[PDB]
Design an enzyme around this catalytic site. Structure first.
Site, PDB file in Angstrom:
ATOM      1  N   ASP A 120      18.620 -21.730  50.314  1.00  0.00           N
ATOM      2  CA  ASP A 120      19.764 -20.655  50.434  1.00  0.00           C
ATOM      3  C   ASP A 120      20.077 -20.609  51.930  1.00  0.00           C
ATOM      4  OD1 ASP A 120      21.438 -18.463  50.625  1.00  0.00           O
ATOM      5  OD2 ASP A 120      20.028 -16.892  50.149  1.00  0.00           O
ATOM      6  N   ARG A 135      26.036 -26.398  46.789  1.00  0.00           N
ATOM      7  CA  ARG A 135      26.002 -26.163  48.107  1.00  0.00           C
ATOM      8  C   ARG A 135      24.547 -25.733  48.744  1.00  0.00           C
ATOM      9  NH1 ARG A 135      29.028 -22.077  46.367  1.00  0.00           N
ATOM     10  NH2 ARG A 135      28.478 -20.123  46.832  1.00  0.00           N
ATOM     11  N   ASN A 136      23.772 -24.944  47.975  1.00  0.00           N
ATOM     12  CA  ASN A 136      22.546 -24.377  48.394  1.00  0.00           C
ATOM     13  C   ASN A 136      21.244 -25.275  47.861  1.00  0.00           C
ATOM     14  OD1 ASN A 136      23.074 -22.363  50.260  1.00  0.00           O
ATOM     15  ND2 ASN A 136      23.459 -20.978  48.562  1.00  0.00           N
ATOM     16  N   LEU A 180      20.578 -32.082  62.297  1.00  0.00           N
ATOM     17  CA  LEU A 180      20.969 -32.284  60.870  1.00  0.00           C
ATOM     18  C   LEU A 180      22.271 -31.515  60.601  1.00  0.00           C
ATOM     19  CD1 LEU A 180      17.653 -32.616  59.156  1.00  0.00           C
ATOM     20  CD2 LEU A 180      19.111 -34.538  59.489  1.00  0.00           C
ATOM     21  N   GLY A 181      22.300 -30.212  61.064  1.00  0.00           N
ATOM     22  CA  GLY A 181      23.429 -29.455  60.897  1.00  0.00           C
ATOM     23  C   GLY A 181      23.449 -28.177  61.716  1.00  0.00           C
ATOM     24  N   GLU A 182      23.979 -27.077  61.268  1.00  0.00           N
ATOM     25  CA  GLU A 182      24.096 -25.775  61.960  1.00  0.00           C
ATOM     26  C   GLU A 182      24.070 -24.666  60.698  1.00  0.00           C
ATOM     27  OE1 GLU A 182      26.292 -27.642  64.360  1.00  0.00           O
ATOM     28  OE2 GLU A 182      25.897 -26.460  66.222  1.00  0.00           O
ATOM     29  N   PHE A 237      24.103 -19.102  63.740  1.00  0.00           N
ATOM     30  CA  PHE A 237      22.759 -18.690  63.431  1.00  0.00           C
ATOM     31  C   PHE A 237      21.702 -19.748  64.232  1.00  0.00           C
ATOM     32  N   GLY A 238      21.620 -20.695  63.327  1.00  0.00           N
ATOM     33  CA  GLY A 238      20.320 -21.663  63.987  1.00  0.00           C
ATOM     34  C   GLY A 238      20.492 -23.186  63.439  1.00  0.00           C
ATOM     35  N   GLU A 239      20.533 -23.926  64.411  1.00  0.00           N
ATOM     36  CA  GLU A 239      20.468 -25.512  64.514  1.00  0.00           C
ATOM     37  C   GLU A 239      19.331 -25.871  63.372  1.00  0.00           C
ATOM     38  OE1 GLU A 239      20.117 -27.143  68.295  1.00  0.00           O
ATOM     39  OE2 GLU A 239      22.365 -27.575  68.252  1.00  0.00           O
ATOM     40  N   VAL A 240      19.412 -27.006  62.810  1.00  0.00           N
ATOM     41  CA  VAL A 240      18.237 -27.740  61.926  1.00  0.00           C
ATOM     42  C   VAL A 240      18.340 -29.046  62.624  1.00  0.00           C
ATOM     43  CG1 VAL A 240      17.403 -28.601  59.821  1.00  0.00           C
ATOM     44  CG2 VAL A 240      18.577 -26.245  59.929  1.00  0.00           C
ATOM     45  N   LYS A 284      13.974 -25.913  61.724  1.00  0.00           N
ATOM     46  CA  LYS A 284      15.142 -24.780  62.047  1.00  0.00           C
ATOM     47  C   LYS A 284      14.831 -24.207  63.087  1.00  0.00           C
ATOM     48  CE  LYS A 284      17.964 -21.186  60.119  1.00  0.00           C
ATOM     49  NZ  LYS A 284      18.275 -20.205  58.913  1.00  0.00           N
ATOM     50  N   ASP A 315      22.790 -16.424  45.101  1.00  0.00           N
ATOM     51  CA  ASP A 315      23.835 -17.011  45.706  1.00  0.00           C
ATOM     52  C   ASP A 315      23.358 -18.833  45.340  1.00  0.00           C
ATOM     53  OD1 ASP A 315      26.023 -18.262  46.797  1.00  0.00           O
ATOM     54  OD2 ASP A 315      25.230 -18.241  48.993  1.00  0.00           O
TER      55      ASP A 315
HETATM   56  C1  LIG Z   1      13.959 -26.164  58.150  1.00  0.00           C
HETATM   57  C2  LIG Z   1      14.803 -25.408  56.996  1.00  0.00           C
HETATM   58  C3  LIG Z   1      14.369 -23.775  57.226  1.00  0.00           C
HETATM   59  C4  LIG Z   1      14.991 -23.148  56.115  1.00  0.00           C
HETATM   60  C5  LIG Z   1      15.828 -23.647  55.348  1.00  0.00           C
HETATM   61  C6  LIG Z   1      16.570 -23.007  54.035  1.00  0.00           C
HETATM   62  C7  LIG Z   1      18.134 -22.971  54.482  1.00  0.00           C
HETATM   63  N1  LIG Z   1      16.126 -21.392  54.201  1.00  0.00           N
HETATM   64  C8  LIG Z   1      16.190 -20.679  53.024  1.00  0.00           C
HETATM   65  N2  LIG Z   1      16.049 -21.140  51.662  1.00  0.00           N
HETATM   66  C9  LIG Z   1      15.820 -19.929  50.993  1.00  0.00           C
HETATM   67  C10 LIG Z   1      15.509 -20.044  49.629  1.00  0.00           C
HETATM   68  C11 LIG Z   1      15.252 -18.656  49.166  1.00  0.00           C
HETATM   69  F1  LIG Z   1      15.105 -18.300  47.811  1.00  0.00           F
HETATM   70  C12 LIG Z   1      15.104 -17.678  50.033  1.00  0.00           C
HETATM   71  C13 LIG Z   1      15.341 -17.610  51.170  1.00  0.00           C
HETATM   72  C14 LIG Z   1      15.573 -19.014  51.701  1.00  0.00           C
HETATM   73  O1  LIG Z   1      15.656 -19.343  53.009  1.00  0.00           O
HETATM   74  C15 LIG Z   1      16.071 -25.160  55.051  1.00  0.00           C
HETATM   75  C16 LIG Z   1      15.390 -25.805  56.006  1.00  0.00           C
HETATM   76  N3  LIG Z   1      15.382 -27.362  56.058  1.00  0.00           N
HETATM   77  C17 LIG Z   1      16.832 -27.859  55.784  1.00  0.00           C
HETATM   78  O2  LIG Z   1      17.986 -27.253  56.005  1.00  0.00           O
HETATM   79  C18 LIG Z   1      16.704 -29.225  55.510  1.00  0.00           C
HETATM   80  C19 LIG Z   1      15.674 -30.002  54.908  1.00  0.00           C
HETATM   81  N4  LIG Z   1      16.244 -31.419  54.899  1.00  0.00           N
HETATM   82  C20 LIG Z   1      17.639 -31.360  55.197  1.00  0.00           C
HETATM   83  C21 LIG Z   1      18.294 -32.387  55.264  1.00  0.00           C
HETATM   84  C22 LIG Z   1      19.625 -32.060  55.823  1.00  0.00           C
HETATM   85  C23 LIG Z   1      20.126 -30.858  56.291  1.00  0.00           C
HETATM   86  C24 LIG Z   1      18.992 -29.976  56.120  1.00  0.00           C
HETATM   87  N5  LIG Z   1      17.904 -30.113  55.848  1.00  0.00           N
END
Ligand SMILES: Cc1ccc([C@H](C)Nc2nc3cc(F)ccc3o2)cc1NC(=O)c1cnc2ccccn12
Length: 276
Positions: free
Chosen positions: A149, A135-136, A13-15, A16-19, A34, A131
């Site tokens: 985030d 984008r987040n 799905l994307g990219e 530290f760490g792959e998802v 992730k 943040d």
């Molecule tokens: C698997 C995972 C682990 C971690 C995270 C997120 C980025 N981590 C995170 N958020 C936070 C909010 C805070 F307040 C504090 C800390 C935080 O740390 C997100 C995800 N999931 C996706 O990225 C995802 C889901 N569906 C799609 C579709 C497309 C692309 C990507 N995705």
């Protein structure tokens, strides 16, 4: 805890760490997973473990939810909801405002109210996001929004962050004047970033905040807020935004942090007042 063998890796799905998009047999059950990069440094692993800990605090319909973890074995995994429509910035970018893929003005308000509700929850925990920006945020089925985030390192949003060697990376175009000058963050600066995020939504993510100004100009603008001689400059009213809703954004950018409306009041406006 979580059974790693129950996971079926499908697409990246994307990219530290792959998802990755994965399936869980329970049958058409989809999650996001992730995973730490194979060559992750000790520092990256520590940060990943902390992300897990921070995330485990957060339990709200409009915040990313940690569904499960695989930390008692390598590599480390975090499991969330799969959000079909990906990030909000990319999502809105692919839409145009309905005339007379499209999105309507009331749907834009519903998107914004969901962000406000998620932030309302965070405020109750005294948790400062630091943040907030489109984008987040992630978009699931039926325009459902979850705040996340992703950190500050993705190539796609490089231009949204101000970088000086040996300093914290700073999303200056979303930052309250006091954050720019003094490098600290509060719920009140989260409100200011919410005003900017709401500006992005109503712009359908067509332009960077202060896009025609340099980074250095955006920083000097914080100085002008401080001096309060009426030379500070604001984001202009978006085409799709009526004056009443713009005035809400302006309250989010009040010089005095105490004059910025709480998220409870912001949510009320977006979910109720803005309907008339
Ligand atoms: C698997 C995972 C682990 C971690 C995270 C997120 C980025 N981590 C995170 N958020 C936070 C909010 C805070 F307040 C504090 C800390 C935080 O740390 C997100 C995800 N999931 C996706 O990225 C995802 C889901 N569906 C799609 C579709 C497309 C692309 C990507 N995705």
């Amino acid at each position: 805890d979580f059974p790693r063998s129950r996971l079926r890796f499908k697409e990246k799905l994307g990219e530290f760490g792959e998802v990755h998009l994965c399936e869980v047999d329970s049958h058409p059950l989809l999650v996001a997973v992730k995973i730490l990069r194979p060559d992750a440094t000790k520092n990256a692993r520590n940060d990943f473990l902390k992300e897990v800990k921070i995330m485990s605090r957060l339990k709200d319909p409009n915040i990313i939810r940690l569904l499960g973890v695989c930390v008692q074995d390598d590599p480390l995994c975090m499991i969330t909801d799969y959000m079909e429509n990906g990030d909000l910035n990319q999502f809105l970018s692919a839409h145009q405002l309905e005339d007379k893929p499209t999105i309507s003005y009331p749907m834009l308000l519903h998107v914004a109210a969901q962000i406000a509700s998620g932030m309302r929850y965070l405020a109750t925990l005294n948790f400062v996001h630091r943040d907030l920006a489109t984008r987040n945020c992630l978009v699931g089925e039926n325009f459902t929004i979850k705040i996340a985030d992703f950190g500050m390192s993705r190539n796609l949003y490089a231009g949204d962050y101000y970088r000086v060697q040996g300093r914290a990376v700073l999303p200056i175009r979303w930052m309250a004047w006091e954050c720019i000058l003094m490098g600290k963050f509060t719920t009140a600066s989260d409100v200011w970033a919410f005003g900017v995020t709401l500006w992005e939504v109503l712009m359908l993510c067509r332009a960077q905040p202060f896009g025609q100004l340099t980074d250095e100009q955006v920083i000097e603008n914080a100085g002008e807020f401080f001096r309060d001689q009426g030379r500070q400059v604001y984001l202009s009213r978006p085409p799709a935004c009526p004056q009443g809703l713009y005035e809400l954004m302006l309250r989010c950018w009040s010089r005095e942090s105490e004059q910025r409306p709480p998220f409870s009041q912001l949510h009320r406006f977006l979910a109720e007042d803005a309907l008339n």
